[PDB]
Design a protein around this ligand. Structure first.
Ligand SMILES: CCC[C@@H](C)[C@H]1CC[C@H]2[C@@H]3[C@H](O)C[C@@H]4C[C@H](O)CC[C@]4(C)[C@H]3C[C@H](O)[C@]12C
Ligand SMILES: CCC[C@@H](C)[C@H]1CC[C@H]2[C@@H]3[C@H](O)C[C@@H]4C[C@H](O)CC[C@]4(C)[C@H]3C[C@H](O)[C@]12C
Lengths: 50, 36, 551, 50
């Protein structure tokens, strides 16, 4: 917008260009992580945790 | 604003008055660029 | 009667059972849908079908009386059918089939009609000039030699060029030899030598259409004269027949008919200008035609007769061939398109066949058609069977994969893998995954997903283009804060910032126009803008504007 | 509306509108071919039904 451009200028902050579509605990829940499992397609690189 | 709702049959002239253009192809969107 | 008896109980109990209705039902054989029609007709006054034996009345008498009258008609009815496919079978079951000799007569009728049409268009040879001009332009390399004409009735380009040279020689020796006793013979010879040539359908049709346009212009002029001399002047038709016909060129029939001492002649004075203009246009066109319009009129009559004969001829051929298409079409009943649609699409391919069929090669039609029909059904099933249209090529590819996949499963006792499919086919594997993603048909948004509240699937799909209300309040808060930090500045710099960025205005003016109004050369206005920015930058003037900096 | 996984969800009105438009276009094309009146009558019946 016209004021979000001026604000970015004064503070010199640029666009992220990526979202934050991350998984997070549902509000009100509180437990411990007891298991994690990763499934990857055939063509993918199988990151370190996998 | 409005004080009544009147109802009646529509003339073809009125139906053309509502419209902003004529649909001529059964197409919906492109299958790769998902654009209209 | 029987229906009335059925009503008797309906009302007496207020309800009835499917069995009692079906039984009291008039023996009148009903094709299911008819029974469906009457059930509601009875439901009109209100009744409970209840396959089993048994909640208030809210039916207007008007509905009731009308339902009663239509119910009476149902009994008096004979073969009422509310089904298009059934109606089609009946209207089609009224034309006999043709035997093997039954297409030869039709085919020769078609050939005779088209020959008559060709000669009639041939008689009007003015087009020959247009054909010669087109050939000259083509020989100027504007187009291909073989595109303009599909050969001659003879096989080599040199022969065609020789024939064109002879045609041009005859055209020049005939056009410049009108001075009339022998000119007609020269024109006939020119037409005869032109008959040996063969023209592409598009160019021939264009010539025919141009001739039709000219004839329609002449007819428009004649009818304009007729309306300006009859309706306005009540001119007797006998005078028109006597004068206009016989010469049809000079102004004697109209201009020199004003001195007939008749009221219509005097009334023609008012409309003499427009009719005179029409006569001038005709004289020119009559010269352009260079032929008696009556002769032309007879040419058009003969052409019309031939065309009508040809059209009614194929008509019968296509009626027996409608007798067909029903078979091939039933082979694709569940392919995503409705049966009557498949049949109507086949009827068009059948028409295409009949017009391109040559009986000389003695092909069984029922074979020069069973193809043209299937091509047209499949082309359709591919071009209008899916809500998101797919190219014919992609559909072919998808069908091929679905097959190669069935065979691989039967000989592997396991669904194949995108890798094994790519190997078995000839595809870069990623292409297979792209074709294996072309989403199948869209899901119905009314698909019942319930058992709790009778809610549909479309109820759970959210809107993702909506601004959250804390972002609309945040926006207004910045649109304000900006006013504070900026107002806390002097006028000229504040307006510089306002114009540069577009705060409260309708354009992000560049430096040039800002200098125009503020009188300068960019660098100074650039100077004024930078001071302001470094200024609003220091703390004690940018704490809340900082807060608006998501972090 | 597009869904997850490339699937699409559509309203049933799109099917009905496509039916109407296909049959109307076919009728217009068939009137220009001077087809036998049986075909045009059947096409008009189909258009009415759609
Ligand atoms: C039985 C109750 C109806 C409802 C719960 C069932 C019936 C058909 C099912 C959908 C369809 O399969 C099409 C898609 C398939 C994808 O894999 C997951 C989503 C998708 C919309 C399905 C979710 C759900 O499972 C549906 C709506
Ligand atoms: C009791 C019936 C189950 C019903 C509540 C479940 C079964 C399938 C689920 C839908 C499907 O996932 C398809 C869509 C996926 C989107 O991401 C969110 C919307 C969407 C409609 C889903 C919402 C909901 O979760 C659905 C309708």
């Amino acid at each position: 917008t016209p004021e979000e451009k001026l604000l970015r200028a004064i503070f010199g902050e640029k666009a992220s260009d990526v979202k934050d579509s991350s998984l997070r605990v549902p509000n009100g829940v509180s437990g411990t992580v007891i298991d994690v499992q990763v499934f990857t397609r055939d063509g993918v690189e199988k990151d370190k945790r996998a | 604003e409005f004080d009544a709702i009147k109802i009646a049959l529509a003339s073809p002239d009125m139906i053309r008055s509502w419209s902003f253009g004529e649909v001529k192809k059964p197409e919906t969107i492109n299958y790769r660029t998902f654009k209209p | 009667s029987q229906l009335k008896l059925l009503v008797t109980r309906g009302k007496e109990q207020g309800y009835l059972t499917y069995a009692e209705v079906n039984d009291h039902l008039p023996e009148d054989i009903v094709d299911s849908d008819q029974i469906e029609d009457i059930i509601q007709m009875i439901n009109d006054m209100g009744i409970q079908v209840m396959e089993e034996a048994p909640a208030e009345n809210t039916a207007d008498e008007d509905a009731a009386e009308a339902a009663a009258q239509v119910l009476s008609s149902v009994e008096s009815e004979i073969g009422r059918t509310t089904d298009p496919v059934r109606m089609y079978m009946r209207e089609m079951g009224t034309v006999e089939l043709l035997t093997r000799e039954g297409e030869i007569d039709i085919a020769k009728r078609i050939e005779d009609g088209i020959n008559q049409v060709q000669c009639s268009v041939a008689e009007y040879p003015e087009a020959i000039t247009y054909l010669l001009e087109q050939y000259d332009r083509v020989e100027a390399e504007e187009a291909r030699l073989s595109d303009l004409i599909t050969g001659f009735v003879d096989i080599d380009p040199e022969l065609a060029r020789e024939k064109f040279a002879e045609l041009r020689a005859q055209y020049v020796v005939t056009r410049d030899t009108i001075k009339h006793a022998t000119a007609q013979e020269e024109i006939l010879k020119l037409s005869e030598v032109f008959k040996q040539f063969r023209l592409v359908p598009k160019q021939f049709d264009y010539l025919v259409n141009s001739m039709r346009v000219m004839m329609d212009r002449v007819r428009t002029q004649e009818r304009l004269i007729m309306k300006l001399c009859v309706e306005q002047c009540k001119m007797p038709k006998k005078n028109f027949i006597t004068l206009f016909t016989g010469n049809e060129t000079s102004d004697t029939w109209f201009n020199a008919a004003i001195a007939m001492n008749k009221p219509w002649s005097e009334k023609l004075h008012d409309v003499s200008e427009e009719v005179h203009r029409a006569l001038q246009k005709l004289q020119q066109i009559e010269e352009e035609t260079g032929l008696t319009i009556e002769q032309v009129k007879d040419i058009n009559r003969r052409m019309s007769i031939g065309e009508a004969k040809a059209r009614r001829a194929k008509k019968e051929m296509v009626e027996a061939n409608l007798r067909l298409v029903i078979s091939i079409a039933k082979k694709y009943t569940n392919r995503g398109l409705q049966f009557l649609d498949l049949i109507q699409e086949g009827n068009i391919g059948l028409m295409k066949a009949v017009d391109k069929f040559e009986y000389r090669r003695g092909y069984k039609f029922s074979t020069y058609a069973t193809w043209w029909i299937r091509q047209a059904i499949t082309r359709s099933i591919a071009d209008q069977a899916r809500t998101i249209r797919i190219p014919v090529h992609m559909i072919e590819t998808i069908n091929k994969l679905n097959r190669i996949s069935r065979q691989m499963l039967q000989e592997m006792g396991r669904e194949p893998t995108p890798e094994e499919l790519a190997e078995r086919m000839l595809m870069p594997e990623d292409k297979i995954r792209k074709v294996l993603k072309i989403a199948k048909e869209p899901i119905s948004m009314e698909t019942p997903i319930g058992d709790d509240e009778d809610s549909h699937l479309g109820d759970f799909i959210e809107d993702t283009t909506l601004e959250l209300p804390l972002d609309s309040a945040t926006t207004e808060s910045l649109r304000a804060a900006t006013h504070d930090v900026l107002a806390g500045l002097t006028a000229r710099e504040a307006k510089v910032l306002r114009m540069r960025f577009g705060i409260d205005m309708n354009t992000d003016y560049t430096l040039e126009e800002v200098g125009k109004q503020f009188d300068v050369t960019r660098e100074r206005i650039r100077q004024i803008e930078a001071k302001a920015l470094r200024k609003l930058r220091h703390p004690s003037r940018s704490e809340v504007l900082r807060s608006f900096l998501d972090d | 509306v597009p869904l997850d996984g490339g699937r699409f969800a559509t309203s049933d009105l799109n099917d009905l509108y496509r039916r109407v438009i296909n049959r109307n276009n076919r009728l217009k094309r068939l009137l220009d071919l001077a087809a036998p009146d049986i075909i045009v009558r059947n096409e008009k019946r189909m258009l009415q039904e759609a």
